[PDB]
Amino acid sequence: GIREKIKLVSSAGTGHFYTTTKNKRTKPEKLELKKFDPVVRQHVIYKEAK
Amino acid sequence: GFEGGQMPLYRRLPKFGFTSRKAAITAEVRLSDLAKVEGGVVDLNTLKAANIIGIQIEFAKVILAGEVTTPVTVRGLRVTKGARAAIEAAGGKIE
Amino acid sequence: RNGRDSEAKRLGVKRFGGESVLAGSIIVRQRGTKFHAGANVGCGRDHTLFAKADGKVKFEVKGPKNRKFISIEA
Amino acid sequence: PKIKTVRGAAKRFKKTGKGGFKHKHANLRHILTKKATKRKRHLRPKAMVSKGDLGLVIACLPYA
RNA sequence: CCAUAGGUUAAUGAGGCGAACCGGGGGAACUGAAACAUCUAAGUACCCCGAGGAAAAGAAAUCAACCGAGAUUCCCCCAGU
RNA sequence: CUUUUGUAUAAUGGGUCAGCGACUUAUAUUCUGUAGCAAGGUUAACCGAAUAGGGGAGCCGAAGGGAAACCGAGUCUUAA
RNA sequence: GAGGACCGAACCGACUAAUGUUGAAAAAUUAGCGGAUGACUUGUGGCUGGGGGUGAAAGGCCAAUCAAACCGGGAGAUAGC
RNA sequence: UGUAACGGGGCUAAACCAUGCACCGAAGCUGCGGCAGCGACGCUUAUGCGUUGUUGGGUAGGGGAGCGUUCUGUAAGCCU
RNA sequence: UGUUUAUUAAAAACACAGCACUGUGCAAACACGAAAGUGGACGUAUACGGUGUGACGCCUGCCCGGUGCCGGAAGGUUAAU
RNA sequence: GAAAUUCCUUGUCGGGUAAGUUCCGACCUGCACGAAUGGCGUAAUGAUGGCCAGGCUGUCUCCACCCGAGACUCAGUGAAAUUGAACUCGCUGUGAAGAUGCAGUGUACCCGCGGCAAGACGGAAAGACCCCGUGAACCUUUACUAUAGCUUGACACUGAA
RNA sequence: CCCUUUAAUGUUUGAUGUUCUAACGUUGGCCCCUGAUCGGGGUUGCGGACAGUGUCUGGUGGGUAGUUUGACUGGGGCGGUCUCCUCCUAAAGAGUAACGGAGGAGCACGAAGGUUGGCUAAUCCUGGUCGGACAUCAGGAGGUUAGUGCAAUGGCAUAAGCCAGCUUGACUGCGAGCGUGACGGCGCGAGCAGGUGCGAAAGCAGGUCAUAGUGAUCCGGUGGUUCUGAAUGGAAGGGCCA
């Protein structure tokens, strides 16, 4: 509701992104996680918490 | 498709896909039609002379659908893996 | 001031005792436990017990708290 | 006159081999962040039109 | 002022009516959409103008697809695609 | 009679007779029956000594999966 | 000798009551009533045409029809009643 | 509005209670005759017809059979 | 005084003389009219149109925030181009 | 100023009447008057609204009688609305819930004529009210979308210095 | 000799006033057609690139016009309601109405998720540096009367409660099988594949104790995809995936 939608973009150069939510006013740290990229089939770092 | 005024099923559901404009110009040749092509040579233009495919067709595929019996010669078409194993099983050469 | 209720969740026992179930068959839908997962039965995230194996459904009170379990016996 | 196909139905359904109709699933257009990935995974294959709906579809698609 | 406009007198020709078809100029709304405005009905009803035994169109600034076709009109399919 | 939960109903309709008065038609589609021919079946316009014969342009069926390219008794899904 | 003066017939109206209400009459009769030299009244022609006219204004009147006349057409509008 | 709070007459049992027996009483059941649907019957030898079982209230509605009318053929036929 | 719902309302309604506001410089504003044109008017601000009020008598208070109208255009926004 | 305006309200007080929810005079506590959608008066005027009085009377108490036109009888002519069919009583009960028709029971010879109007949910007009219809019309406006008009600028007609 | 700038004489481009007349206006005079207040021509006068018309355009516009203005409802209106969750009604399976009885939701959370290793409350008594009924500490009682990010109900000690360690499984593709709806749909799911986290070993995780926290299609937007690519090669648009 008052959590914005962010767009977790992979580090593997492929265009695969996850999308999730985030309290933007509470947490301004760029959320980064090691998630799975199906385009390369490895766990890579996803970044850019919009 | 009226449902009362409930949203109808053909509007409840998403449209999908596109029309190919190459599926309209392709046809399938059964193996039953390899004996009627009048000459033992299955071209594209000789399948139309025997009224097998259709006059607007540019691509034909020969599929395994029944009983190739004769020495035939498929030239310029596509055949499947079953139809290639049946045309050569009756003595036919594919170009 | 009133007027609201919710849709009924169709809870309760779906396969009773002595019934033969396939694996993956839902045996009881419930909110809490009220029925614990014995042998050949998973609990599930909404606590829906379900048959992990083919066999018959078996209810039995067992434990130091007289809790109702559900086994599956092939 | 010829029967006019409901043209908006002819983009939602395609007729299959034994006579039924395949269709794309609803609920996979937008608003997907909140949907589970398991739930979105099951809406990706095409489904068959149900029993009760089929009489409404062959009414709509007479040249299918 | 030339000269026009005008004025007169001839010869010609025209007008008016007609049921439909036809070409052109104008052009609805009810209705359908289960309301309604985009859309529909429908360029229909109607109104006007003009013509002929028919009219209009018509001899590629056309299509096709690397082969080709060869002016317009009408009919059957293509395809309810 | 109609309409209704329900009508002797004080609900509707009819003064009476006689004549007329309301599920049609065209085309498309699907299903059942039936008939002909069957992995084929049928022609439309038109020609025509006209219900004949010609005309197979087509249409439907014998193959399907896939959004599609494509592949094809399999194919899509998916690196699999 | 003035006067949208007064009384009062014709004339023009239409306040009250009774009758009439399948009437003598789809608005009248009978007894009274208002104006009666005037913003009067009347004849004969004319002119304004329908979303228009005309209106000392009532939605009045526009051929016994008026919150949109009549006639013909769209048209067998549509009618979950 | 008129007895108007057994349907009435009337009843001291013709009212209650208990018991018992008989009888009346329906389009129910049974008898007798008929008709139809469905089955099971190979009963027949297309299978009609038979044999047995059982079923036949019906609105909406579905299914299955007919009747008659006008017109065409059969029809320059038959009736008149 | 008058007018009005012809055909259930004649009135306190309408009109009115008067009053005020406002528009209008004449090819007037307005109105009818796709236009030409014509009313206004063969008139011209002591004239015309629109609105409100309604002889006469005494009178007409306070509010310019809202909404219009009128005047201003420095800024802010803003079309086609 | 309790008014063409005052709900409470027949306010309250005065007058008028034997008695007055109306009237007239006030008071002001103006639900919710008010100054050109004019305020307060105002002679005259009005088929104007309300109130009182005198005259007058069949308006009335309370009607009587009379005169004509019908009604009524005879002769002639000759409609109408309506109407399922009728061999068409009362009561009480029942019942689609207010019965000539059902039940039970009273009563009742057959058929007119003049009358009357209690019922036949009497006749008339597919309720005008009230609902409903994704009815309609017309009207309103700061509803929506347009549009005539009016208005703005650009380009055109349209030039020179 | 080709530059940015600092201000100019020759000079393009955009407005401003004046001036002019030669379009245009003339509903000024005069002449003619014509002893015709129309019209047209002429000739002067005045106005003059204005005015006015066309196309485009902004505003204004009930002056007209087309229409819309919900349903439920113990008649309609007014009021209230409309989707979702929990309880009761609900008759010991499921389901079950009313303008029946009570409450809540339209989120939150990168930890409040995963895992691994621990842990066990409320209240009360007593003791008492301020300190009181209650801050903290210590014992006793008590046994969950607590706690569960948010209602209520089902649960919860193997804790689903509480604390730290390390972490991203809040994974991708699927899915036997079921449950639940008229359907659209929604839900549960072992297992398999690929990768990953936690154990100083073995031993789990496809979000949260569960159930509310939501919106079909169309139409677009944004990435990805060598799927289509209207002669061909491209592209545009479409598809598919997010």
> What total number of domains does chain C contain?
1
Produce one character per residue of B66-93: b if its CB has 16 or more CB atoms within 10 Å, e if not.
eebeeebbbeebbbeeebbebbeeeebe
Would you say the C-alpha torsion A36, A14, D27, B15 has a positive or negative sign?
negative
User: Resolution of the deposited coordinates, in angstroms?
Assistant: 2.6
CA of residue D1 to C1' of nucleotide E23, angstroms: 29
Q: Give B41-50 contacts, CB < 8 A, sequence gap 24+.
A: B41/B72, B41/B73, B41/B75, B42/B72, B42/B73, B42/B74, B42/B75, B42/B77, B43/B75, B43/B76, B43/B77, B44/B76, B44/B77
CA-to-CA separations, B72 to A40, B35, B52, B68, D34, in angstroms, rounded: 48, 8, 16, 8, 60
> What total number of domains does chain A contain?
1
Say if the Cβ atoms of A20 and D32 lie within 8 Å: no
* A19 CB within 8 Å of a chain D CB: yes
* D4 CB within 8 Å of a chain B CB: no
The CA distance from B26 to B88, in Å, is 24
Are C and D neighbours with ≥3 CB pairs closer than 8 A? no
Q: Would C1 be classed as within a structural domain?
A: no
- The dotted CATH code for B26-94 is 3.100.10.10
Of the candidates B76, B91, B72, B2, the one whose C-alpha atom is nearest the C-alpha of residue B31 is B72
CA-to-CA separations, C74 to A22, C36, C44, C61, in angstroms, rounded: 48, 19, 21, 19
The CA distance from B28 to B60, in Å, is 6
Residues around strand E, C-beta < 7 Å: B 4-5, 19, 24; D 1-5, 7, 10, 63
Give first-to-last CA distance, chain B, whole Å.
Answer: 51
Q: Would C73 be classed as within a structural domain?
A: yes
Residues 6+ apart with CB under 8 A from C26: C14, C15, C48, C49, C50, C51
The CA distance from B68 to B94, in Å, is 13
Shortest CA–C1' contact from B4: which nucleotide?
E34
Distance of CA C32 to the CA centre of its chain: 11
Of the candidates A15, A49, A21, A17, the one whose C-alpha atom is nearest the C-alpha of residue A35 is A17
CA of residue C34 to C1' of nucleotide J33, angstroms: 79
B14: nearest CB among D24, D49, D57: D24
Task: Print the domain residue range for A26.
Answer: 1-50
Q: Which of chain A's residues have a Cβ under 8 Å away from the Cβ of D32?
A: 19
Amino acid occupying residue B61: K
Say if the Cβ atoms of B13 and D12 lie within 8 Å: yes
Domain boundaries, chain B: 26-94
Q: Would C6 be classed as within a structural domain?
A: no
> Which residue in chain D has the smallest CA separation from A5?
D33
Task: Print the domain residue range for C54.
Answer: 11-74
